[PDB]
Structures are given as structure tokens and as C-alpha cells.
Design a protein around this ligand. Structure first.
Ligand SMILES: CCN1C(=O)c2cc(N3CCN(C)CC3)nc3c(NS(=O)(=O)c4ccc(F)cc4F)ccc1c23
Ligand SMILES: CCN1C(=O)c2cc(N3CCN(C)CC3)nc3c(NS(=O)(=O)c4ccc(F)cc4F)ccc1c23
Length: 128
């Protein structure tokens, strides 16, 4: 697994971007991320895919918009998102990446599918 194969992690802090605190963004961090973080299948989704350590040499040849819940946590914390939808899109990207890279019905896919169902359940309680 060649050195330099991992990209830098996604950007999580941009001081140029304006910042606001929103009941929806607060819900995404305090409820949604918390609940998914603690799920029995969360571990593989908690940090950027380390292609070297996990022996996935073609990951970043295939996946050009990587996303993970560690990145999302940091983005919420740093007020990276102006609206809830930007954050929801990062979650969707994380699940879609798994469905692109992996064969349907593989173990990691079933793990993603369970998390995604829980995510969508929690998203339906998103406040006004
Ligand atoms: C070492 C004991 N063990 C198994 O033999 C085993 C099989 C297993 N399967 C294989 C069959 N597939 C349809 C369902 C998940 N999941 C987990 C499992 N579930 S898990 O943490 O979501 C998981 C971890 C690694 C992995 F490669 C696949 C997994 F589903 C934990 C522990 C075990 C397993
Ligand atoms: C969610 C991001 N992601 C993947 O899309 C992914 C695929 C993956 N594969 C699939 C191909 N297979 C031959 C090797 C491992 N391993 C891990 C992986 N390695 S792992 O934690 O040892 C692991 C977890 C669950 C599992 F079912 C199999 C694993 F190898 C971590 C994270 C990911 C993966």
C-alpha cells in the first residue's frame, strides 16, 4: 500500500465562511451525530478511510468525495455549515460512497444501510 496514498482529510474549518447557530444545526450535532456515533455499526464510519492501514489501495482511485462522521462532527463544531441541508448532504455522501465502492450486500454495506435508516428516522424529527 504506497505511502502518500491517503489524501488529507476533508476541510473542517474555514474562518472565511460566515457562522450562525441554528436549532437545526444544533439538533444535527447534539442528537443526530450523537445517536449515530454510538451505534453498534458506527466504528468504520467514525474517521476518514485510511487506505494504507485498512489495505484498500484503490479506495481514493474510486471515491473522490470522501466523507465520514469524524469530519461531520468537526464541521458542526466549527460552524462550517450555514444550513442543515449542507450537513445532511455530507451524511448522504458518506452512505453513497460506501454503496459505490462496495459490492451490494457486502457486510460494510449492510452496516451503512442500518445507519442510514436510523439517520433518516432522526432527520424526520428535524425541528422548524
Ligand atoms: C469474530 C466474531 N464475528 C464473526 O464471526 C462475525 C461475522 C459477521 N457477519 C458475517 C456474515 N454477514 C452476512 C453478516 C456479518 N459479523 C460480525 C460482527 N459484526 S460487525 O462488527 O458489524 C463486522 C465486523 C467486521 C466485519 F468484517 C464484518 C462485520 F459485520 C462482529 C463480530 C463477528 C462477526
Ligand atoms: C465506511 C468506509 N469503508 C468502506 O467503504 C470499507 C470497505 C472495506 N472493505 C471492503 C472490501 N473488502 C475486500 C475489504 C474491506 N473495509 C473498510 C474498513 N475496514 S474495516 O473497519 O476493517 C471493516 C469493517 C467492516 C467490514 F465489513 C469489513 C471491514 F474490513 C473501514 C471502513 C470502510 C471500509
Amino acid at each position: 500500500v504506497p505511502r502518500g496514498s491517503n489524501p488529507p482529510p476533508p476541510e473542517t474549518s474555514n474562518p472565511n465562511k460566515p457562522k450562525r447557530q441554528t436549532n437545526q444545526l444544533q439538533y444535527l450535532l447534539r442528537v443526530v451525530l450523537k445517536t449515530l456515533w454510538k451505534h453498534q455499526f458506527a466504528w468504520p464510519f467514525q474517521q476518514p478511510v485510511d487506505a494504507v492501514k485498512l489495505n484498500l489501495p484503490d479506495y481514493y482511485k474510486i471515491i473522490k468525495t470522501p466523507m465520514d462522521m469524524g469530519t461531520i462532527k468537526k464541521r458542526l463544531e466549527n460552524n462550517y455549515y450555514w444550513n442543515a441541508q449542507e450537513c445532511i448532504q455530507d451524511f448522504n455522501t458518506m452512505f453513497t460512497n460506501c454503496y459505490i465502492y462496495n459490492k451490494p450486500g457486502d457486510d460494510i454495506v449492510l452496516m451503512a444501510e442500518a445507519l442510514e435508516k436510523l439517520f433518516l428516522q432522526k432527520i424526520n424529527e428535524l425541528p422548524t
